[model samples]
Target: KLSEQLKHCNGILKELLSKKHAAYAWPFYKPVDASALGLHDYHDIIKHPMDLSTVKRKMENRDYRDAQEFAADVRLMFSNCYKYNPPDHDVVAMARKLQDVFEFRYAKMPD
Candidate 1:
């Protein structure tokens, strides 16, 4: 069952990326285009920029050892959002919603 845990983790990720959560998830689907967005201080502010697509890539590459590690990268994506964007920003709100949904689903994973 080496892949069982990863299979479960991928299921959660898939749910988050589904159309139902698109409104909040879309903004985090890929890395931020800091240059095009003119966020000159983005890299300086958020040293570790993370995104859902990157997480998916890592999972597919078997980079994560366990569900906790996978969850950590997902959390990093939201943490970067909070660090780089103002609390009142629309993306921040979306990050909050998506984080909540992710945490709720992750918590229900069978032990």
Candidate 2:
């Protein structure tokens, strides 16, 4: 049963990475390069950095106990974006849109 749940959660992530959401999801696919980006205080500000690739790896490794745990990391990725970037930043807007898509799918997951 847990495996089935994991499959469903993976499906949701796959959908997010699909062509429809690819544009918005692009920024979150990999970890932020704080050093290259000159975000010196990035680690200080965002204690827990998260990304879609990390989420996928965690899911494959069975690190998540349930969909809620998976959802948390997904949200954390966006939350970090909001915290590090200005409110009106382009990435923030992308994060917001992707968050909506993720939430909609997550809410429909069966218990």
Candidate 3:
């Protein structure tokens, strides 16, 4: 039962996060179909580790203190992105976006 629930939840999260990232990725990637993702960009960068317990991969001379710190910070800041990128995100809007069409967020705000 636990594994089943975990699988289901993981599947849904992966599905949605993938889609959410895709929305923004589309504009950035400028793809004609599911074909432009890696056609022009993928794994091209330099890196440096901030410390131990951290495996930092420098992307273009940029490096984090560690891999875990980089990954954690990236994901935390870019909650719904492909590579920890910042596009746009809001808590209230996100809640409504998950529940409905984000109509409630604007409806109750000062006008």
Candidate 4:
């Protein structure tokens, strides 16, 4: 329990894997009047590129230290990212998706 929660918070760093990409490209694609719009620092948020295949590989290859570490990563993803997305999707369904993945991955591990 403690390990999972601890890992969940620390695991947000993995989000950098996606953060360093075009997932946030829509607002950055066009060049708007930075001075007039007060967006002088908009360019800073523009990510490099979307190469999720590499991140996926890392995820697949990771040798998790324990169930806590694994739970932390997945729980963090759902808590920070999925739960807040769209802001309109059913909360139950969103949680269900996370639950399904958690179960699929950890059902075989010791409690």
Candidate 5:
């Protein structure tokens, strides 16, 4: 009985996996941390990429332009650099996308 809440969370995650884009779903669900982002930085990633929060917020507001920009900035930044070993989109693309979408403004910063 105590485990049911955890089960429900996992269950929701499981069903989400079906409709959820591969970019968002983890093979085994767990709380991600900065270390994950660090792994990407270790490689060539100029900017971290997108994930589910972007999807949720965009869908919520129907702000497709910012959403697409979020996707684009994230993907492009990752494409610019990646480790290409022990592959993980989360370490770069997916998780980064989520973080960036929520935190990083999808603005082209002036150099």
Candidate 6:
């Protein structure tokens, strides 16, 4: 269930990391509801990945590097997120937000 763990990692990071590179945080095919997020301006930029197809299409039109490197970066972010626990209320709210886009997309599904 590493994928789910990765998703959780992204959820955790979304709460902890600034939205500077939100999409790159978890490149899964997921869509997050911005309005329901009740996030501040800093959290607004975290919608880069939007959905899996969107990112895939975007990436197809461009060039990228290894998934291993990106995956490593995500793991590192997860480590940081776990290292710092946000307020209980924030965690709860973030969890709620994650539910809105919890389904798997493309190769992100757990087999």
- For 11-109, candidate 2 gives per-residue lDDT tens digits of 999998789999889999889999998999999999999999999889878899987799899999999999999999999999999999989988788
Which residue pairs in candidate 2 collide?
none
Model 3: per-residue lDDT, tens digit, 51-111? 1112112322344333333334323322323232233444323332432321232223232
Model 4: ten consecutive residues of lowest lDDT? 46-55
**Which is superior by TM-score, 2 or 4?**
2
Per-residue lDDT of 1-111 in model 6, one digit per residue for the tens? 234434443443344333643443342334444457543442344423233334344334432254443344433333333333354545434433443333222135333
Per-residue lDDT for 103 in model 1?
Answer: 93
**Model 1 lDDT tens row, 1-111:** 437777888998898889999988998998999999999999989889999899989988889999989999999999999988999999999999999999998888776
What ranking emerges by TM-score with the best candidate at the front?
1, 2, 4, 5, 6, 3
Per-residue lDDT of 6-104 in model 4, one digit per residue for the tens? 344234324433334234422222333446867565345432222223323434565455556555544543443343334555543544544464455
Instruction: Give the least accurate 10-residue stretch of model 6, judged by summed lDDT.
Output: 98-107
lDDT against the true structure, per candidate, is 0.90, 0.89, 0.30, 0.41, 0.40, 0.38
Ranking by lDDT: 1, 2, 4, 5, 6, 3
State every prediction's TM-score relative to the real structure.
0.94, 0.93, 0.24, 0.34, 0.32, 0.27
Give one digit per residue, the lDDT tens place, for model 5 in 1-111: 213333333333234345444465452133223376465443344234433344344444544443344345435434433433244644455544433443343333222
Tell me the alpha-carbon RMSD of every candidate.
1.2, 1.3, 13.7, 11.3, 13.4, 11.5
Off by over 4 Å in 1: none
Error of 2 at 40 (Å): 1.5
Return the TM-score for candidate 6, rounded to 2 decimals: 0.27
Q: Taking the candidates one at a time, how many backbone clashes does each contain?
A: 0, 0, 7, 0, 6, 1
